[PDB]
Design a protein around this ligand. Sequence first.
Ligand SMILES: Cc1cc2nc3c(=O)[nH]c(=O)nc-3n(C[C@H](O)[C@H](O)[C@H](O)COP(=O)(O)O)c2cc1C
Ligand SMILES: Cc1cc2nc3c(=O)[nH]c(=O)nc-3n(C[C@H](O)[C@H](O)[C@H](O)COP(=O)(O)O)c2cc1C
Ligand SMILES: [Ca+2]
Ligand SMILES: [Ca+2]
Lengths: 502, 518
Amino acid sequence: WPWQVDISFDIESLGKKLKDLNQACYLINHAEKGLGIAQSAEVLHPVSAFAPALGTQSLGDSNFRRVHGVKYAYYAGAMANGIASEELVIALGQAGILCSFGAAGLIPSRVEAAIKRIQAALPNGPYAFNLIHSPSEQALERGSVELFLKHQVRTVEASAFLGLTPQIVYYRAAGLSRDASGEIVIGNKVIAKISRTEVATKFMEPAPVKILQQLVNEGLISEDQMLMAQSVPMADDITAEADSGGHTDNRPLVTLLPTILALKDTIQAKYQYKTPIRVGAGGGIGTPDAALATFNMGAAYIVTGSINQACVEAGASEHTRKLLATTEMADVTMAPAADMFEMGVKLQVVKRGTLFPMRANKLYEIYTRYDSIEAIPAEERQKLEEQVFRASLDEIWAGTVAHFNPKRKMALIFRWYLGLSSRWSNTGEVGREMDYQIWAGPALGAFNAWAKGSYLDDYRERNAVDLAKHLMQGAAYQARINLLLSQGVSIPVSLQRWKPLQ
Amino acid sequence: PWPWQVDEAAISFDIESLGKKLKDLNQACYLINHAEKGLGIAQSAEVVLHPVSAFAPALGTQSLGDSNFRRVHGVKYAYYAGAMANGIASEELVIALGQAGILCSFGAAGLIPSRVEAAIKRIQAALPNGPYAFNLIHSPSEQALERGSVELFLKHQVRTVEASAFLGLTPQIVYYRAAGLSRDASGEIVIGNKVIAKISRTEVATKFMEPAPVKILQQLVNEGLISEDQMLMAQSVPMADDITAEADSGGHTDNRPLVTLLPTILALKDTIQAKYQYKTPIRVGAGGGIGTPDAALATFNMGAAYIVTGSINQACVEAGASEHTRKLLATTEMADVTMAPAADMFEMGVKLQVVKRGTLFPMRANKLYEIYTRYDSIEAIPAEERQKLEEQVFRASLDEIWAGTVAHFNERDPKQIERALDNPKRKMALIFRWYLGLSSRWSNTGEVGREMDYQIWAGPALGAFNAWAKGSYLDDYRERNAVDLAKHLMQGAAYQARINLLLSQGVSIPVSLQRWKP
Ligand SMILES: Cc1cc2nc3c(=O)[nH]c(=O)nc-3n(C[C@H](O)[C@H](O)[C@H](O)COP(=O)(O)O)c2cc1C
Ligand SMILES: Cc1cc2nc3c(=O)[nH]c(=O)nc-3n(C[C@H](O)[C@H](O)[C@H](O)COP(=O)(O)O)c2cc1C
Ligand SMILES: [Ca+2]
Ligand SMILES: [Ca+2]
């Protein structure tokens, strides 16, 4: 290196200079004091190692930040039933951070209200809305899309898809237009969250002609839109969702992400889109360490979820938040999902401080083993009635009927619990604590452990914005440390990691 | 920020040339954003003609991982190929890796002592100065056997053991460690017998990071097995030099996320190292999920001293696995693995990670656990379900299987047969375990006609590998050499570090150059 200097061997000061990512670091050894650092040099103590000013903006894909209009290559993933609440979106968006409104499970009127509120607060973004695939209820998907289009909601996080549907195709294609120069403008942005290559492929490739044609025919998109749709991917960003809270197939981040990046390279080479497809990732990200790891694999951006439910902005009860602050990595497990209960799908939930997973598991065993509720041995039937429902199955069924084969009846009854248990947690239903269904992964325990001993120990002091900052600033910090280490600098262990001190 | 300038015609804008130069890790890279032709790159600069807008130093694989790991183990990369049972991590594998300066752990688990001794002799002939290791697997039921292995290792001066499946210390692993301790000419401690402990739980890591306890040491001294000075020395050095954090992986696993497990173990390391202040610090590396350069890089950059591979090595021509298996393994995609009942600890619900494409083992094994748990006894299994097992799985009556098992365990370990009845559950388990046991052997040896029952250990790392490799010469199983894979992961990781660097400076690197490809 070409520099020399004439500052500093003061350990506390070493920490301060290292942590200022807005300034370059010039490193000196000598003897003693034996590692020194300066923030200015000149083209006579020469310089042994260097780190440039590289901050949070240096992580991830700059195009992600440009396209979404955000300060970080980060987003807070949707959380069902308004858990990713209006307050959450607004707080994050006010900070220049992307967040997906948790539309899943909410009624249309509720979603409309959220749109209005969010748009009032964030007239020029950033924000996204969750569009969840609803296999059983196509009309509902159509409805959400119409709403989004009606209000010019420009960004959607598409999740739980098994491939394309006419509704997501419609959203995508309806946003396309030509600029003065004749180039395609992609007005409706899509972030497709996936865990399989088969589905990723569908979103990385253009929409099919036949679906497009029907949309033209139905008067939903224009001929040119149909044409344009054939030359742009179905999503701008692909979120690889590894092992995570909620619905998940438990794939390792370190294998999923690389696999999807491989796929990306393949598709990009084949289509040569003018704007390259981006691949980001989530699932397991609760620390600076994990955040950096994910960027380091080639993630365009990172996604958090579990840690955000723990924050004061989230639509989750005080009880629940409090409990989330104590939840360790061993305190989560797989349990039956209300959605696709019948096929045995499971989701990752909290199992300490609640009996939900045991109870859900019981409902599945019973559902699968009996023909009808009548076949359930008056025996365990009565314990269910006592411990789970707190009312005869018949009475549950009556309520259900007012909310409007025997196997189907049994499911409908059981889904009362599977469904309401999530609501109970979200709203804080008193006396129903032991039945709270609370979605979370190992990310949360990771976070908690990382934060132990800090101000973050108090659930009341957890703000989504702050968490984002820690992950991003921490990652950036640790990137600098790696750079110096790579060069043979002896950074003291106590400075090697970003910890929450303030 | 950059104090150099560069004369044109040293610069290229050529994309073929960009790639070549980026990939040359022995030379630094000076980048310039020219009005045109845009991105340029040179490998020499002035110091005052265009100014430099981005830089990457010459930094190669040696900057990855812990240099002490390399010095201590006498290897050229901070990497090791993990043990694979029943000789899957074969003599051929160990030799090929060791000959290249790459650490490999011989798969001694399940092999008989004479076989292990033969292995030792062959390996030591080929590698008189290393590097190599031997797997010492904990056998909770069978301390005499663990004892024999250590005895064999000490006899032949096998200096490096990969200690796996431990739940804590045992007198055998302690003996191994302590017996290797000597003084140098200055009186300093020499750690002759190196130990790499592979763990997934903090409770176990802790034991291996701390010194051997007084009580066991004292015992060894009393038995005449180690000297008093060796006992003294043992109190100042860790039980293991290296701790491998094993995340989600092929074979036995508790499916821990690498991105949460490794930082947890590193933090523990820091704590213990700070407490004991060992002259040579304890190190933590990691495996589980490492099948690509991206993953390798991220792992190093989390703080791993080294990386460990396992699933990908089984796929290589040196592995002690059948040609059929190896060929299969090249077809395995990331979702083509699943958890299945383990033969070892079947009854306790222990599972392991196996291939589920091109073999029905997992489906069949899972069915067995289902049946075992559901029914009181073999006689209670619905006639037609039991029939389908006999046709499709056992290829014989359950009573014929039982017959063989009795005969077998009566010559080997009659305790099982005794214990197992009156108690139909245990008898049923014993019968089912016949399949769980042999299915591995079938794969390893390539039993003809038992292809759909092959038990083949593997995690998603293999799938990621296959995806990474797709379209390359590596598509052909016959072209997969362990050394080559190691080198690809190491060099690729180095390459990606440079790419990341440059990207972080805002350099527009073409998508096709962002990842290291075969
Ligand atoms: C309580 C909770 C609710 C969630 N709800 C949704 C949802 O409705 N739709 C969706 O696509 N993802 C949902 N997610 C997934 C997150 O958006 C994110 O992808 C995931 O949580 C990241 O993994 P992590 O849990 O390891 O952080 C939810 C996650 C949690 C923890
Ligand atoms: C087929 C196979 C056999 C293995 N046998 C052993 C063994 O006998 N002892 C052991 O400690 N680890 C064993 N392992 C684990 C590997 O040594 C290594 O730790 C692990 O495979 C790395 O994770 P990965 O599968 O994601 O690469 C085995 C792994 C595989 C795939
Ligand atoms: Ca999820
Ligand atoms: Ca394993």
